[PDB]
Structures are given as C-alpha cells and as structure tokens.
Write a protein that binds this ligand. Sequence first.
Ligand SMILES: CCCCCCCCCCCCCCCCCC(=O)OC[C@H](COP(=O)(O)OCCN)OC(=O)CCCCCCCCCCCCCCCCC
Ligand SMILES: CCCCCCCCCCCCCCCCCC(=O)OC[C@H](COP(=O)(O)OCCN)OC(=O)CCCCCCCCCCCCCCCCC
Ligand SMILES: CCCCCCCCCCCCCCCCCCCC
Ligand SMILES: CCCCCCCCCCCCCCCCCCCC
Ligand code: SF4
Lengths: 162, 169, 309, 143, 101
Amino acid sequence: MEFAFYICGLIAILATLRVITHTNPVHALLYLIISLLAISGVFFSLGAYFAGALEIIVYAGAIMVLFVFVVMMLNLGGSEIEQERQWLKPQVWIGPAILSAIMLVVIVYAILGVNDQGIDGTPISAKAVGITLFGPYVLAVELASMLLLAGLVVAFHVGREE
Amino acid sequence: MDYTLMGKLNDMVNWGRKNSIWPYNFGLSCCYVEMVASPRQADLMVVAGTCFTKMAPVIQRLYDQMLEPKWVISMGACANSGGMYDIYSVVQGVDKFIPVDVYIPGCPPRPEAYMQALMLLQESIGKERRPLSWVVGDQGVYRANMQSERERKRGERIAVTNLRTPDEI
Amino acid sequence: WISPELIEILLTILKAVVILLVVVTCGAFMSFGERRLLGGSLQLVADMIKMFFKEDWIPKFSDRVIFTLAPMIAFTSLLLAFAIVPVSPGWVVADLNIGILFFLMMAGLAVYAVLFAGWSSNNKYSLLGAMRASAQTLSYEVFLGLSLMGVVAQAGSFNMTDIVNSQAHVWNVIPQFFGFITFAIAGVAVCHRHPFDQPEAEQELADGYHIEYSGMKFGLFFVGEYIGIVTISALMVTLFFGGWQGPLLPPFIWFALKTAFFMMMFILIRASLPRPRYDQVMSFGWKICLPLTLINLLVTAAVILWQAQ
Amino acid sequence: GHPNLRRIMMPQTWKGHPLRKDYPARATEFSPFELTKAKQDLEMEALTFKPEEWGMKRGTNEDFMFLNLGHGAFRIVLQLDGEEIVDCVPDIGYHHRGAEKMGERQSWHSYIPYTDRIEYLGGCVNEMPYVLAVEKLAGITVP
Amino acid sequence: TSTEVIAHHWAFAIFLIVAIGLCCLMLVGGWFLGGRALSAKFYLVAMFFVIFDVEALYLFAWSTSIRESGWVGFVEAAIFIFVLLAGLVYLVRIGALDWTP
Ligand SMILES: CCCCCCCCCCCCCCCCCC(=O)OC[C@H](COP(=O)(O)OCCN)OC(=O)CCCCCCCCCCCCCCCCC
Ligand SMILES: CCCCCCCCCCCCCCCCCC(=O)OC[C@H](COP(=O)(O)OCCN)OC(=O)CCCCCCCCCCCCCCCCC
Ligand SMILES: CCCCCCCCCCCCCCCCCCCC
Ligand SMILES: CCCCCCCCCCCCCCCCCCCC
Ligand code: SF4
C-alpha cells in the first residue's frame, strides 16, 4: 500500500514532466491522462476511494476528453510554434525553472519539520463523503451547482458558433 | 510438384487463410449484378466487369490499398481478356495491370461458377508457401504450378456422348 | 511450500483467469453468432490465424502510438469493467466498494478509443465521423451513471454483491423500469451498437473510424466490441435481474441463462429496429433520457425515505 | 454558346474523337506509363480541383464545400452550403464501352449481343428496337 | 490483513496484468508475424457533458447515502436537481442543444 503510492507518485511526476516539455498536443494530453491515472492510484493507495473514482470518471474522463476534443477541432499541425520550440532553448526555461526550484525548496522546507504520525490508509468510503457533502456542507453543494451553471452559461456565450 | 517464386505450422497458416477469405466485390459492370468491407480489411478482390480506361486507375488504387496476402479473381470475359469489347475505351483484360489468381469464363458466369472459383482459390491457397515472419527465413512467396482445370477434367469431358436435344425445356 | 493461504490465493487467481478466458471466448463466439445469424470454432480459429498473419500496416502520415493505443482501449476498457461482476458466490474477481463507479471509469476511458482512432486516422472525413460518434457517446454517458444511481439508491451502496443481495426478493427491473430502460439505451449507445451503429451515415463529409484499421487491430476493435456488450449484458443482469439468484437452478446457471438471453436480445434489436437520424439521437438523449434519470432518482429517494420507519 | 463544352465520355486528356470514321475502333496497346499518370492525377484531383473545369461557380462566400460521391459506379461533384446542395455535376463516362462504334464494326447479325449488353437489366427489351430497325431496313414484316 | 482481502487483491492484480498482457502480447504477435510487401456544436455538447457529469458526480455521492441523510437531504438534492433541470431546459429552449437549426 506504500509501494503502490511511491510508484504511482513517481509515474505521475515523470508523466507531468514529460507533459510540460512536449510539443505534440495529443501526446501531451495522453501523458496527462497517464498522470491522472497515476494520481488516482495515489488516491486509492491512501484510502480516499471516492477521490480516485472521481479522478478517473471526471478528470481523466470528462475534462481531458474536452481538451482532446478541442485539440482535434482546432487541428494543431505545427502552427509556427512546433517549428520554433522556444522552451527547449535555455534562455526561455532556465529562469522559470530556477524560480520554480526555489519555490519548491521553500515549500519542501516548510513541509519538513512538521509532526507526522503517518497516513493510516484506512478507506474513507464514498458514503461518508456523501454524508458529509449533504450534511455539514449543504450550501457548498448548492452553490457548486450554481458555479457549474455559471460556467455553462459563460462557456456557451463565448464558444457558440453563430 | 514445382513452385514459382517447421512445416506443419505453414499448413496451419494456409488452412487459416484458406477458410477465412473476405472479398472486396468490385462492381464495374453487369457481372456484378449477376453475382449479387474496406479494401484494407479484404484479402480477395473480385473484378467482375469491363475494365474501362476511365476506371482502370480506380481498380489499381483499390488493389494497392489491400494488404498482403492478397488474391484476385477475375469473373467474366471482360475482366478475363476484354471480352467482346475490343474497343478503344476498354482495357483488354485486368491481368494487364494487376496479377490474377483465378479466371472464370462466362458473360456473365453463374454464381455457382464464382463458388467453383472460390474452391479453386482455396486449393491454391492451401498448396502454397509464404514467409511466416518478416524477420526470419526466406521472404519469398512460393506459388504452386497447379494442374490445369481443363486438363484435369479432360477425361470426363471427352467421354460425353449424348446430350438432351434443344427442343424441350 | 504447502500452506492454505497460498492455496487460497492460487484458487482465487485461477478463478479470475477462468473468468477472463470465458469472457473473451464468449465474446468471440458472439462475434461468430452475429456473423452467422445475420466446425464453427474452427472457422473462428481460421479467422484469428488470418488476422495474425496478415501484415499489420500503419499509415506513414499517422501517429504510431495513438493508432496502436486506440484498439487496446476499445478492448481493455470494458474487458476490465467486467471485473466487478459477481458470476457466482465466491467467484467474483474483485469485491470493490466502488463497483459500478469502476464501471463508470472504464466507460469514460472507453470513449478515448473512438477519439484516438479518429485522430490517428489521418483523414478529415474519418475525423469528422469519429467526432460525431464521440459526441453521441458523451451524450449517452451523461446519463448512464444516473440510470445506475437509481439502483445504488435502492441498494444503499456501490458494492456489487450488496446490490445482488438487495435483489433477493424483488429484482430491480420491476421498481426501476425507467432506470432499466435508460441503462439499456445508454449501454447500447456506449458500445456503438444498433440503432446508433454508424452516425456518419447521415452525411457524406464523414467516414467511419474503423476504416484504415486492418488486420489484427481491426480484430481488437471487433473482439473488444463484443466483449463490451458481454459485460454490459452481465452488468444489466447483476443490476436488474437478480444476478445469480434464482429458485431452482444453480446460481452460475441462472446467471449464464440471463446473460445469454440479453445477448440474443441485443442481437435481435440489431436485426430489427431501424436507423434514426443523428439529430434525432441527440435530441432524444439530451431531452428525454437525462431528465428521466433525474425524475426517477427523485421518485426513488421519495419512496425510500417514505418506507423508512 | 455552350456553357461548358467538355468531354463527357472520354477523359479530358483524350486525343481524337472516337466516332470519326478515321479513328480506329479496336483497342490500342496498354501502357503502365499512361496508367500511372492517370492514377497520379486521380490521386491529386482533390488537391487541384478547379471549379470551372466542371461548370461550377463561386468556388470557395467561402462557406461552400466541394465533394465527390462514389446501378453502376459513377462520380458526381457536389457543391454544398453546409448540407444543402447548391450545384452538382455528375461525372459520367466511366462505363463507356463504345457500343455505337461496335455498330460500325460488326455485321447486322453479329451486333445483336452488343444490343443486349446496353441496359443489361433489359435483355430482350434492348434486343427489340435493334431488330425492328434492321427489319425496317430489310423490308421484313414478321409473322 | 485477512487472507480473503489479500487473495482478492492478488486476483484483481492478476486479472489486470493478464488482461493488459494478453492485449499487448496479441498485438505483438500480430505485428511480429506475417510477411511484408470544424463546427462548434461539438464543443458545446462536450462542454455540456463535462458540466452535467460533475453535477452527476454530486448525485453519485448523494445516492449512496439517501437513508442516512433523511428528508432534509432529499430537499437539498431536489433543489440541486431543479437547478440542473432549469439549466437543461434553458439550454434546450434557447437552441444550444438543437442539433439541426
Ligand atoms: C512495477 C514497476 C513499474 C512498471 C510500469 C508501471 C505499471 C503500473 C505501476 C503502478 C500500478 C501498480 C502498483 C502496484 C500495486 C500492487 C498492489 C498493491 O500494492 O496493493 C496494496 C494496496 C491494497 O489495498 P489496501 O487494502 O489499502 O492494502 C492494505 C494491505 N493489506 O493497494 C492500494 O491501496 C491501491 C493500489 C494502487 C491503486 C490501484 C492501481 C493504480 C494503477 C495506476 C496506473 C497508472 C498508469 C501506469 C502506466 C504505466 C505505463 C506508462
Ligand atoms: C499500457 C498500460 C497502461 C496502463 C494500464 C494499467 C496500469 C496498471 C496495471 C497493473 C495493476 C496492478 C494491480 C493494482 C492493484 C489491484 C488491487 C487493488 O486495486 O486493490 C486496492 C483496492 C482494494 O479495495 P478493496 O479490496 O475493496 O478494499 C480493501 C480495503 N482497503 O482497490 C481499488 O482501489 C480499486 C481501484 C483501482 C483500480 C485500478 C484499475 C486500473 C486503472 C488503469 C486502467 C488503464 C486502462 C488502459 C490504458 C488507458 C489509456 C492510457
Ligand atoms: C456469458 C457468461 C460469462 C461467465 C463468466 C464467468 C464464468 C465462471 C464459471 C464458474 C463455474 C463454477 C461456478 C460455481 C459452481 C456452480 C456451478 C457448477 C456447475 C458449472
Ligand atoms: C428529519 C425530517 C425533516 C422533515 C422536514 C424537512 C423539510 C424542512 C427543512 C428543509 C431545509 C432545506 C434547506 C435547503 C437549503 C438550500 C440552500 C440553497 C442555496 C442556493
Ligand atoms: S463479361 Fe459480359 S456480363 Fe460480364 S461485364 Fe462483360 S458484358 Fe457484362
């Protein structure tokens, strides 16, 4: 239950590292789906079963389908960027990578030194998440519906063809 | 028997190819509507009609889209040789430009003639040797020079004496 | 090296692999049954030999990874979605607490087969046709889950064996008739079955995504298609028709009889019910089936909370 | 004054007019050379489609799309506003057998099978007007 | 840490591994053997699927605990479902979901 967590975390890290340093959009989305599967494996290794279930049902099964759908619709076949590839020349990526490494080392220094009994991995089932969702989190559910309705309206208003 | 340019599995492969044949029926002309799958999935091409000069390229391209192993059956005198249309706009035979494995005379042949051609093709497939893999062994196709059908059936054809007279149905 | 935990885990491994081989062989047998009704095992073996030894050709202007990955998805998605179905007491592959949620993950991954095949088939018409097909499958996967959620509400949990045990007295086809018909429609839509076989037939600027797939990848698509309807029928049995529960026959016999009956019913409505239009399919889905699932879930919740003393 | 006087039976790159009396009826030698040219122009036809070599107009408005469609096999070029047909020209001549030229090269008796193979579903219906016209030429009244 | 749960874990692992290995090995056998020689309504329907799938996941969480939430949870989910149906009716009526205008 720990070996699965470490191997899935390593797979997720390597997959998003390949995502941010790739040029083909479909390959980037495929490696992104691979990392989402890995992070769902991370969730299942921790006992958050419902989180992994919604990770593959929705994140790697609805949102990334929309990203792939848009990629095929706009038909990116080397529109002046696949022939340039600025993110491989060092003057574009060394600076932001240095800044990100500094932020990572600051956050990691914050993480260490914090008391840790370990993660038990006890399965928090979907019925407990459902009880909490419609119990002490009622307005969160109703206004998450309101938020998704707002997103529906704005995405229709922008993206319609006419 | 002679052939033209470790053993039991070859017979197994031949049996599998022989019993599973997926046709691509080329319409072309009236042999098609007598006798009645993408070309990528089909392994047998049945040319049934006149090879016109305007759609010889269509036949050539749809033959080139198919994948090895591929066999060709030519039904009808038009696809055999040009038939009765020795004329400017007709290619005199589909074997001018694609290799044909079985030929059927007739204008049109019966559907049972196409069944007989399928049996002939099945025997031809069963008695040939092809490479098992593209990395091991000879990468050559060994077609067998089979006994001709008109010399095989010569004795019973010559032995015919009397037929029914044409004044009855 | 003799101990009965090792013996037990080897028996469960044997049960899982036996289930897997029976599923793949029943899918191949259904492929031949549909080919024949519209030695037989010798003809299937000869077909498999032809697909093995024909050359697997990849287009030069096509991505190799996506083209190779689409039939693997089309097979493995519902072939792994079968793993939650209990075919007999003690003969279930995995007793997951997510269950039909795991089935929903596999359906959501199954849409990627159509999308990937359409993109890797370097053709505008094939891309448009597969994009219409993926739009239809999304439009029916939008309510597949809720059509199952009615039964989850009645059983009270996501586990498969719990649903089967709640189907001890009355099978949920009788209370959840609308959930049953919506699940049947969405399952027949997800696996690309008739009526919704080829949505590109309504327009000549679109072509099928099965084209340019030749030989063994085409065979992967075919066997995965029939395996997908194997597991759709088995899930319909275990969610609406008692699973393995019956009065006289042994439980596996009852499950097999129900699954075979739904198999022939799917063959029959391939053979009988004709073709609707594409906009008719979209309108029917988005304007009938999703509100039907919502109203059925509300009525199910009201009935459940009414019958709670 | 004809709007588009192009070839309808022969391909556009055809030399000579086959029904003239100095044009030979019989088939010339086959060439893989010309065959691969005709194949390569059939492969590049969609790329180099010029919609006035067909009588079309307003070619790419720019919402209009030109397609080719595949009772016999023939092509028809379609001009579309979305899914509505604005104009279409059917490309025929893919089934041209030179039957009238064969009429000039068979005897009156031995041309009868060729009359059968025009409108192949007809058979004797296609046989009938030919023998009726030959019998008009021959001064024959049949019983 | 019972023998039944570890037996089921190993059985599920063997099922997944043998299934993916069977598909991969059969593709490998196919490749190795044998000789050689757009419209924006699609975005609209995918977007609607995404949004309605997230509201579906909310109902997924609700349905497994209908008994424990009581009538108050029924009222909350009825408000949720009514908002969802109002959005669906809005999309249908203003022509977002009409495929042939
Ligand atoms: C092997 C080296 C790498 C080889 C290439 C990559 C292959 C995939 C590697 C990752 C997935 C398999 C990892 C190994 C899992 C083996 C089973 C295991 O460890 O189970 C432990 C645990 C069981 O559950 P629990 O009840 O919590 O355990 C208590 C123990 N009594 O289990 C759990 O709690 C959950 C287990 C993890 C979640 C399920 C599996 C997720 C799979 C994600 C795949 C992502 C995509 C990978 C693509 C690779 C190729 C690019
Ligand atoms: C080319 C390869 C691409 C990648 C292919 C897949 C990679 C992984 C394959 C190897 C998997 C090894 C085994 C993994 C563990 C199996 C057992 C398991 O999941 O146990 C954990 C848990 C048990 O739950 P339960 O027993 O009910 O409760 C006990 C209390 N803790 O059960 C769970 O948590 C169940 C939920 C996890 C189920 C994961 C299923 C696989 C997901 C990936 C599918 C990939 C589909 C193909 C590729 C798609 C496109 C990339
Ligand atoms: C289409 C049917 C698919 C079924 C897949 C799983 C098959 C499992 C077979 C298990 C056989 C034993 C079941 C328990 C004993 C009861 C029956 C005994 C006689 C067979
Ligand atoms: C335990 C039995 C209770 C029976 C009576 C139930 C009905 C009365 C209480 C209803 C409370 C509903 C609260 C809903 C809040 C919705 C907020 C929406 C914000 C947009
Ligand atoms: S051989 Fe005879 S029947 Fe066949 S296409 Fe030619 S004219 Fe028609």
